[PDB]
Design an enzyme around this catalytic site. Sequence first.
Site, PDB file in Angstrom:
ATOM      1  CE1 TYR A 150      -7.570   6.311  29.572  1.00 49.66           C
ATOM      2  CE2 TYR A 150      -8.014   7.971  31.421  1.00 49.66           C
ATOM      3  CZ  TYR A 150      -8.621   7.277  30.321  1.00 49.66           C
ATOM      4  OH  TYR A 150      -9.439   7.674  29.640  1.00 49.66           O
TER       5      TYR A 150
ATOM      6  CE  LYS B 109      -9.694   3.716  31.546  1.00 51.45           C
ATOM      7  NZ  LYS B 109     -10.314   5.013  31.996  1.00 51.45           N
TER       8      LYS B 109
ATOM      9  NE  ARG C 220     -11.738  10.328  26.099  1.00 53.35           N
ATOM     10  CZ  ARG C 220     -13.057  11.230  26.003  1.00 53.35           C
ATOM     11  NH1 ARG C 220     -12.880  12.493  26.068  1.00 53.35           N
ATOM     12  NH2 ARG C 220     -14.114  10.576  25.593  1.00 53.35           N
TER      13      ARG C 220
ATOM     14  CB  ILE D  67     -10.808   1.003  33.813  1.00 57.43           C
ATOM     15  CG1 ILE D  67      -9.923   0.478  35.083  1.00 57.43           C
ATOM     16  CG2 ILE D  67     -11.412   2.277  34.269  1.00 57.43           C
ATOM     17  CD1 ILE D  67      -8.619   1.412  35.376  1.00 57.43           C
TER      18      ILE D  67
ATOM     19  CB  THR E 277     -12.077  10.089  30.595  1.00 50.19           C
ATOM     20  OG1 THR E 277     -10.989   9.922  30.753  1.00 50.19           O
ATOM     21  CG2 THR E 277     -12.617  10.823  29.319  1.00 50.19           C
TER      22      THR E 277
ATOM     23  CE1 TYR F 280      -3.678  23.038  23.548  1.00 50.53           C
ATOM     24  CE2 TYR F 280      -2.681  23.882  25.745  1.00 50.53           C
ATOM     25  CZ  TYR F 280      -3.295  24.105  24.371  1.00 50.53           C
ATOM     26  OH  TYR F 280      -2.968  25.400  24.032  1.00 50.53           O
TER      27      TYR F 280
END
Lengths: 298, 298, 296, 298
Positions: free
Chosen positions: D137, D166, D142, D207, D47, D111
């Site tokens: 992840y 993550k 998001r 990360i 990202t 989405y």
Amino acid sequence: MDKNIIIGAMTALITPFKNGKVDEQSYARLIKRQIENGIDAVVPVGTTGESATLTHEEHRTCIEIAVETCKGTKVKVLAGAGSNATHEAVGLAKFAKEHGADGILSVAPYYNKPTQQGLYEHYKAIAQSVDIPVLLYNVPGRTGCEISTDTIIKLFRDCENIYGVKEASGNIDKCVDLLAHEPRMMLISGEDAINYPILSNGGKGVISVTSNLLPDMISALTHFALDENYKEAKKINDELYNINKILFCESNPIPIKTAMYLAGLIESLEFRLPLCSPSKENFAKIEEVMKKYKIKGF
Amino acid sequence: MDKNIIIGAMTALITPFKNGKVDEQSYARLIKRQIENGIDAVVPVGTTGESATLTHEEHRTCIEIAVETCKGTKVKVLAGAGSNATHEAVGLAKFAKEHGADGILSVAPYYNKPTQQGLYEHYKAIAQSVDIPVLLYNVPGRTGCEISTDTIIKLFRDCENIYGVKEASGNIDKCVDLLAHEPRMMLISGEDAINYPILSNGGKGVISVTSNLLPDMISALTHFALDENYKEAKKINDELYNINKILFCESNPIPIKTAMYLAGLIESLEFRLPLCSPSKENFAKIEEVMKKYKIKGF
Amino acid sequence: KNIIIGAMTALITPFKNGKVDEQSYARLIKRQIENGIDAVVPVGTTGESATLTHEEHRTCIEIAVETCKGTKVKVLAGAGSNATHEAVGLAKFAKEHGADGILSVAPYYNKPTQQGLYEHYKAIAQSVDIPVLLYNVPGRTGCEISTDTIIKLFRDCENIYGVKEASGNIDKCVDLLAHEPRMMLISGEDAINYPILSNGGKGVISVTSNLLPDMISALTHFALDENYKEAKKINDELYNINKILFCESNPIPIKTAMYLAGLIESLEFRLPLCSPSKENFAKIEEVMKKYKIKGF
Amino acid sequence: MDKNIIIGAMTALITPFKNGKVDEQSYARLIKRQIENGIDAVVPVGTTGESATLTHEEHRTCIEIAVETCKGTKVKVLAGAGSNATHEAVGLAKFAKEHGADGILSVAPYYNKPTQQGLYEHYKAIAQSVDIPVLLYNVPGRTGCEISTDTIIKLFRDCENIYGVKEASGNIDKCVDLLAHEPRMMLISGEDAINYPILSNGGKGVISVTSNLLPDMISALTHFALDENYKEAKKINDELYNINKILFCESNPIPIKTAMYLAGLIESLEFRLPLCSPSKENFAKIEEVMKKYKIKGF
Ligand SMILES: [Mg+2]
């Protein structure tokens, strides 16, 4: 600086009822059991103690019992004394003091959603009204407001008596924020499932729901952590996760009182409205989860 | 089924203070102003009236003043009488009836987060205690709980006195759900910015904050909508949007009392802690937004 | 402006043996046209835009454009992306394939700022010569196009003509139309179609209309003609199906309903979408039985 | 079960542009700076690396440069390779393997909001497509979806290659849940401000965004924690709180790239739309916060 503090393994005491009244002998017996299982302080009439539905006279009675029961021991009484009206919260704080409390736990104003300036003035009035320690209590899911990190720190610095905050906000970022900017405060876990994460970041105790049922385990977790025995503390935190979660399957203290009743530790599964018994499905969920734990008797 | 109801354009009265006491003459004068500007009912000691910080003797005073001031007029008194303790909510409903209220507005229990079964039992007890209309009041952002659609409908159907709900929840989907499943209830808007969408979906009144300042405009909006003149109702709702939103730039009733003071309708900009005056920035915003409206005097 | 409004359907995209069923898609579009629908939206969220290839995107737009040709019905093509260069390209692509306008979703995942959203949409709008409808759905994108940003874009860019709101926020609908009454507010949330229209919204882009096109078009047209009583009656009757169509992420329930109604042969999605749980399957099944579902 | 893993102090690499193209010389130089400052792995095109706006050829180029730059060192390449279309995510996973990545970081579908079953099938297909390690992840803010603990655990147990997750979810309760029920997995912090709490609960690496600017401090924090030097790890985590928070005053990677530019580490402050420069206000805030930190050059 050197403020007076109340820290360590602490219990938000349930309030047992029998025939619609506070069961005072049971309440005393439950407190003795906490003391005998390594608890450092008790919190009469917190959220878990159904403060909302007890009368002010019952508030006094519960505080007096906690104080009497802790005499001859090291255990302290951090009395719930808080309100969404500042004049009332001030009066409640003075009463707690008059009734022998070692310190007070004062919840952020619920329902009326004061601004940060309002919160500052609220807690300042409260702290000035007594000469014993005052622990702030942030629980936005119940109150509808949040005491910001800035406001907590300003209160800690400006008011001698205000020595830290019980956080029930599921926000470890805020716990980092608080202790990074003001390492002198006592950050106290108000959320059992994350007791270990809060302690390992420098938090100095817990005000626990789960300890009502498993005081020995919560006490050990806390004291392992306070001694930097993090492997040991995490092990118990991990073992406690299942019970810590099920104790919130319906609003606290519904599941904890259900558990205490299932365990034979209180005589009736009795609440004051608008609290009531759990659903049959949740009753059974709680019962099954408990089987995995060794529950201390009296 | 033919329930007694209190509907139309209604105002959640601010409570004016002078030197830390309720300004009794001012309260009467503000109510007379509401009556003379087309309002159908007034709500003494709701959230907007600082119910949290008023004493029980003050609740009595405010209700009695509302009752006296509306006597000889078509205006009804829907008294705030609600608590997070069921025994106390029952007492307060009975008291409101005793002081001459036409009906009561009873907020969902805040802070202690009862379950749906608890809410049902809470409100059933309140409804059974009086013989006047009871309007439920859902405001989850302040209470920490939601009265579900199913619970509201069950209460409406099971309890003679319960006739609808004041929704302050920013949830038009729930307003659809409520009136699609139980079209006989009175859904009342507790959120001024969306008064028109609630009314155009079959809602039957508002309990308004903005009407303290602009009673003629809110009452006109409401009456147009009830007469199915949606074009005219929407026009006023759109015109009011700016003021409706600025009156929540800080927690209500901080902005509305600020506006009332600025308009010269109250003598002192005074709250009870933990409420306090707005920030200088918000104060200025409120002052500027006001300039676009015609505010009725006395 | 130049606009595309009225009752519009976010078309599902039928699959057979892992390919777009082109026959079925045409047939379903015909069924929309014949049930009062004013425009169709190929390859929106409901159409599984995320898992279709660019070639399949082309194919669906072409089939929509062709099926509506000679008819009053318009094609508002899904053409949006979280990469501005790609959103510009997809806009040009849509216009090339003869779409009447595009529906352009707010960038998902990368959470641009309001200034970024303005530049994104300004770039798209200045790139083509057809109507652009913004599409705000914060629950899926992780960002919100603010009222101020939407109004600024409407006022600044000739071809941006409104927004499809899927945000469960009637206050924002009031805000938008009170400050800028000339825009076309379009409902993207079936359960609240009536409240959006009764406040001056000018259309819907509907999931439910896939299954019940006659009812959604009737509702929409009654509201546009200010027969609020009849529009509300249908919105109320539709609430149960409108709610069950989101018991799991759209388009999982609508495809399930279309399958159960015999309107598509296979209950097939492209991963990561898949069939609903047994509990939800059965709920959808039972809710449908209270409705009259038109065939072909 | 002997899973192959990539853990330790890791950096989500920013992607520098020059004249609208990937600045390849700058990218190599930035990676060498990470290697020379104690970083154990780098993540090209996550990202933070603006994966959304890079072309597939650019993804290949970034992965190739990371792979080449890490030769002759212990540092590993955990390539961003994920999509909200399972067919594409499989393709990217294979492509990452082909371009020499040591493993892949694979974001939950954004989405389109897959169900838990869909997520399971998504990641199962990805894991079957390659024979290199796969880190899940989770970043609900998001993506609009959450990979549940049950799903993460089922994937870890069922799929040889899936070794951990993550987490960027601000949810330390979930971190407890994951490691309490599946202690063998590698929980990786994707939220810099809470790096220490995650690591102290048994997390095995980070990360990091912040490490772009301060790789030596993030490396030292991580390695102190992995050795159970918790006091020393917490001290850095506390010191870093201010920069960790300001790096999210606007959506990442807007503040981090701004900081790199301010530091002289990249030549231009350039993004691909819809990303763009921060407000002048936020630009200044970032600049002020950095003044408190020692920043290494090349
Ligand atoms: Mg009368």
